[PDB]
């Protein structure tokens, strides 16, 4: 099985113990590390942070301590939008320009592949033709990587993609049968399935539906999303289940109503290191659990939640990671991807569970080491 671990090039700016750079990664935990994110300019891949080139080298230097480790560079993401992707795939000329720049970029800076993180073809302003043109891009990229590999005597560059976990986005964005033929792996973003945008509490990445859920609400679980991809043309062995090392936060309208579906108000509280409303890293969650919070096991969905006064948290822990790891193995899936390794308790000083408790749980459960 594969354990694919995303690293983010803005984590370096978190204060104090939150600051995370490539040298903080244990090179033996994962089979693949993915660098989030590269940008694009004039249909060519490019850096985004002032020190990306330095971080690239430290990132790929991790392979000096693990002969099996592979690295990839992710391009795009949520804030990147869709407009540059729409322009780049619109013509064969622009796709060739981009693909050519990618091969040169990855080989110069030491990456073993590219992870396409377009959010999303056919949505967020992307026109309908991008559903098919995305397949063309991946096909042309896979073929160009294959050519470069056989001519250079080097292992072929990987082409992967982070893909939507929302059914509406999936249907508008991906030709699953043909796309799955050319991607090496399909990293399914089976998280952000509930959050403060809904106005009530819900789990970030529940494995199963809540018992009373019907209709489109019954889409919002890992089991449904993964089986959607599998049953609509994707081979199970290429499908990678998304594992969040963070949770989503809410403000309860009434602290006395603190179950699943309890009413909530604004965007949710922010954490002292990630400093973004609605979002807590796992190491920030451990601090919350030690501040007097009540812990509850969501038995139907196989995930935890916790609350204290007016704050409510839906999240993942060792127990839920273990349940999902066993589940994905018994469903013949390709492994797990983690968003993101800089959100684990990488110092070990927050959770009293050792270093990288969530990532290590998957390392052991997936037979990585
Ligand atoms: C694949 C993807 O788009 N994942 C999202 C992350 O990008 C989000 O992180 C946020 O990313 C922006 C752009 O780099 C940063 O400016 C922002 O600080 C960062 N916030 C945090 C807490 O890391 C993430 C949270 O919004 O949601 C997805 O994971
Ligand atoms: C399954 C699904 O499509 N859920 C949607 C969420 O993804 C989305 O949340 C946003 O997700 C982005 C990654 O895809 C994050 O970068 C972004 O921070 C996050 N926005 C938040 C937490 O406010 C929400 C809100 O846009 O919609 C869901 O439908």
Residue numbers in the entry: 22 to 390
What does the paper say about this structure?
We also directly observed conformational and chemical features of mAMCase between pH 4.74 to 5.60 by solving X-ray crystal structures of mAMCase in complex with oligomeric GlcNAcn across this range. Across these different datasets we observed complex ligand density in the active site of mAMCase. Across these different datasets, we observed ligand density for different combinations of occupancy over the −4 to +2 sugar-binding subsites. While modeling chito-oligomers into strong electron density, we observed strong positive difference density between sugar-binding subsites near the C2 N-acetyl and the C6’ alcohol moieties. Using the non-crystallographic symmetry (NCS) “ghost” feature in Coot, we were then able to observe that the positive difference density between ligand subsites in one chain could be explained by the dominant ligand pose observed in another associated crystallographic chain, suggesting the presence of a low-occupancy binding events. This observation led to the discovery that GlcNAcn occupies intermediate subsites, which we label n+0.5, continuing to follow the nomenclature established by Davies et al., in addition to canonical sugar-binding subsites. During ligand refinement, we observed density for both the α- and β−1,4-linked GlcNAc2 anomers in the active site. This unexpected configurational heterogeneity, which is observable because of the high resolution of our datasets (1.30 – 1.95 A), likely formed as a result of equilibration between the two anomers through an oxocarbenium close-ion-pair intermediate. By modeling GlcNAc2 as sequentially overlapping ligands in alternative conformations, we are able to visualize each step in the proposed catalytic cycle of mAMCase. When the −1 subsite is at least 50% occupied, Asp138 prefers the active conformation (up towards Glu140).
One of these proteins, Acidic Mammalian Chitinase (AMCase), is an enzyme known for its ability to function under acidic conditions in the stomach but is also active in tissues with more neutral pHs, such as the lung. AMCase is a member of the glycosyl hydrolase family 18 (GH18), the members of which hydrolyze sugar linkages through a conserved two-step mechanism where the glycosidic oxygen is protonated by an acidic residue and a nucleophile adds into the anomeric carbon leading to elimination of the hydrolyzed product. We found that mAMCase has maximum activity at pH 2.0 with a secondary local maximum at pH 6.5, pointing to a bimodal distribution of activity across pH. Mutations Lys78Gln, Asp82Gly, and Lys160Gln result in the loss of surface-stabilizing salt bridges in hAMCase and may contribute to its reduced activity at more acidic pH. It is likely that the dual pH optima of mAMCase is intrinsic to the catalytic mechanism, where Glu140 can be protonated directly from solution (at low pH) or through proton shuttling across the catalytic triad (at neutral pH).
